[PDB]
Write a protein that binds this ligand. Structure first.
Ligand SMILES: CCCCCCOc1cccc(Cn2ccc(O)c(C(=O)O)c2=O)c1
Ligand SMILES: [Mg+2]
Ligand SMILES: [Mg+2]
Ligand SMILES: [Mg+2]
Length: 281
């Protein structure tokens, strides 16, 4: 394998370490598109994890800026060379939405002084910032002729996936001093996350959970309805990634909404879902 191959392999490793679901699905893509997703995904992970000060994140942002300004120049990257070298390689062949990386970065800067979200509007704006932006960056990789609707579908999918993630992680997020449900919705449903964490679920909580799960599932259906904005090769894969991810909701239900472990979709169940999906492709 070439030096660049090694860079992409490292990007793969970061993706698979962070998400078996997304790696499971996206490693099914043809080589070229597969590798581009690894790099973009790895950059987004490095960004999301960075603060845990801002130094490295400033360096990531500066590296991304160098690539945007001078895609074909050799740069001595300040942050992670392997990842930036791969991103640069991708950017030389695809139209990367750099402002989307900057939106993600800005959101991550903001998460430092995390304050709970007043309304759902603020929560959904967060979902765009950390996840819709990722859909936007992935768009040119996963579609042939991108237009406003391609970006919109990808953005909505990203956002739904984030919401599902939040719904899986209420417990662990609370332990790390984060509550992503909005005050508006929490107060409406009469839920105190600390209280549920100490005492177990009740009917108020389950109702609030199901309110957000309803939103996620409906967005999923609307994304599926528009699957054809994506390249034919990427369609079943994107569908798969979504389906695997939405199955998480049922795992949460089957575990009775527990706030004390991370539920998951077995590897063998992921294979079943994929089989299901191709019985129509
Ligand atoms: C057309 C392209 C389809 C769009 C794909 C978007 O992929 C993304 C991007 C960003 C976030 C998520 C949700 N997600 C999943 C696992 C996870 O661990 C976290 C976390 O750690 O928060 C998390 O947010 C998914
Ligand atoms: Mg995940
Ligand atoms: Mg994220
Ligand atoms: Mg989470």
């Amino acid at each position: 394998m070439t030096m660049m191959d090694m860079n992409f392999k490292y990007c793969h490793k970061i993706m698979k370490k962070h998400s078996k679901s997304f790696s499971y699905a996206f490693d099914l893509l043809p080589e070229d598109q597969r590798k581009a997703v690894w790099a973009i995904y790895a950059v987004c992970r490095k960004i999301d994890d960075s603060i845990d000060d801002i130094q490295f994140l400033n360096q990531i942002k500066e590296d991304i800026q160098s690539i945007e300004k001078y895609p074909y120049e050799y740069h001595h990257f300040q942050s992670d060379r392997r990842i930036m070298m791969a991103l640069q390689h991708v950017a030389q062949h695809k139209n990367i939405a750099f402002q989307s990386f900057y939106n993600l970065i800005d959101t991550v800067y903001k998460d430092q002084h995390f304050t709970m979200f007043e309304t759902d509007a603020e929560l959904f704006g967060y979902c765009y910032g950390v996840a819709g932006t990722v859909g936007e960056v992935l768009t040119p990789i996963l579609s042939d002729h991108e237009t406003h609707q391609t970006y919109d579908v990808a953005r909505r999918l990203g956002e739904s996936l984030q919401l599902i993630n939040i719904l899986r992680d209420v417990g662990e997020d609370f332990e790390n001093e984060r509550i992503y449900f909005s005050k508006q919705r929490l107060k409406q449903y009469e839920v105190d996350i600390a209280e549920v964490y100490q005492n177990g679920v009740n009917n108020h909580y389950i109702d609030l959970w199901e309110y957000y799960a309803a939103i996620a599932e409906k967005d999923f259906r609307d994304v599926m309805d528009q699957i054809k904005v994506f390249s034919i090769e990427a369609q079943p894969i994107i569908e798969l990634a979504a389906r695997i991810y939405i199955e998480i909701l049922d795992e949460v239900r089957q575990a009775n909404y527990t706030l004390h472990e991370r539920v998951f979709v077995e590897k063998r169940k992921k294979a079943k879902l994929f089989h299901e999906i191709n019985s129509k492709y």
